[PDB]
Amino acid sequence: HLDNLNLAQKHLALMLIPNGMPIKTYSAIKPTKERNHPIKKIKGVESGIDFIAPLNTPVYASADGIVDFVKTNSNVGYGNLVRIEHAFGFSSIYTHLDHVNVQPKSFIQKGQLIGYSGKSGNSGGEKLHYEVRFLGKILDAQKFLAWDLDHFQSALEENKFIEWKNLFWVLEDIVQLQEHVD
Amino acid sequence: HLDNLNLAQKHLALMLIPNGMPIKTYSAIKPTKERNHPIKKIKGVESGIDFIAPLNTPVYASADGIVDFVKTNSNVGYGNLVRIEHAFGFSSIYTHLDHVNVQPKSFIQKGQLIGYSGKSGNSGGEKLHYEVRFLGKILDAQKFLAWDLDHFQSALEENKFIEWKNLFWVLEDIVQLQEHVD
């Protein structure tokens, strides 16, 4: 069934689950594993990815959801940050920000501006730190960056801890309900 | 706009956000405020509702989501329980269960069986304890019990802490995308 998903299922998944790039301009992308981790201060921690980008680069939500946590005047650890809760257990986090433009409890639309990149906290310089998690579990963010309508299998290969078939069964019942209402 | 929502928005909201009764058979419904709270052991705690029902009554998910936490062999506090995370910050919890039939990380469909009612923990007898929350904040569960297609304003009157207009703007963009794909 993961090979024969319909377009309605694909479009719905890409509104609800993080996908694509959260920033339009960057000079480099590097895993956080390869620098001193913002909290643990050692290399080798599986912890998402950093977009090397100049101060004040706009940062955009990677899927619909709700803001559940922000830090707006912090210069320690992750620094200023936004965490977005998405459907079906996914979350995305955006850190080291210069400025935060959304409030906790605010509903979020995919592509909405949520802040401006900075160097706050233990950043190692001007960059956006980005993580995608599933019930708090760290995932390979690159698989979600590369996920789009023309590359739909990308995120589905993050399959060890996520039961994608069962998620798409749930989404099929949502798409069928709207076809019945058309 | 909350008066002129289309049917596609209404149907989508009722798949994603808790609504209706999580149990088919009960003798009484009473707020948990009116009994000794499972944890605090005093009256007057705003804490959801209890369905007075006999042991082994099946318990059903009130919306689509993901199981984020279970207790399966507990006889203290809330007892055996399932917590379901829904989209847009909502959660539902089902407690005092005799048996739990879902695992953490499992995707859930609205109406799916999730366990069997019991008297586990500080239950005060055979009952299902049920709570609906928004980013961890307790809500008036009766407003979600009474919410359905023919009574669509019911949950929308829980309006003090939830920006329903903004939520429905987000849902409108999902419904428009599927109309464009039809």
Numbering used by the authors:
A (entry chain A), B (entry chain A): 120 to 301
Copied sentences from the primary study:
The model of Csd2121–308 monomer accounting for residues His120–Asp301 was refined at 1.80 Å to Rwork and Rfree values of 18.1% and 21.8%, respectively. The Csd2121–308 monomer can be divided into two structural domains: the helical domain (residues His120–Gly139 and Asp259–Asp301) and the LytM domain (residues Met140–Leu258). The LytM domain of Csd2121–308 adopts the canonical fold, in which a central seven-stranded anti-parallel β-sheet (β1↑-β2↓-β9↑-β6↓-β5↑-β4↓-β7↑) forms a two-layered sandwich with a smaller anti-parallel β-sheet (β3↓-β8↑-β6↓). Unexpectedly, the Csd2121–308 monomer (referred to as chain A) in the asymmetric unit of the crystal forms a tight symmetric side-by-side homodimer with a neighboring Csd2121–308 monomer (chain A’) from an adjacent asymmetric unit. In this homodimer of Csd2121–308, a surface area of 1,550 Å2 per monomer is buried at the interface, as analyzed by the PISA server. The pair of helices α1 and α3 from one helical domain of Csd2121–308 pack against another pair of helices (α1’ and α3’) from the helical domain of another Csd2121–308 in the adjacent asymmetric unit to form a four-helix bundle through hydrophobic and hydrogen-bond interactions around a crystallographic two-fold symmetry axis. Numerous hydrophobic side chains are present at the interface, which are distributed in both the helix pair and the LytM domain (β4, β5-β6 loop, β6-β7 loop, β7-β8 loop, and β9-β10 loop). Two characteristic motifs (HxxxD and HxH) of the LytM domain are conserved in Csd1 and Csd3, whereas the first histidines of these motifs in Csd2 are substituted with Glu165 and Lys246, respectively. Despite the absence of a metal ion in the active site, the Csd2 LytM domain possesses a substrate-binding groove formed by four loops (Loop 1; β1-β2, Loop 2; β4-β5, Loop 3; β8-β9, and Loop 4; β9-β10) on the central β-sheet.
The overall structures of Csd1125–312 and Csd2121–308 monomers are similar to each other, consisting of a helical domain and a LytM domain. The helical domains of both Csd1 and Csd2 play a key role in the formation of homodimers or heterodimers.
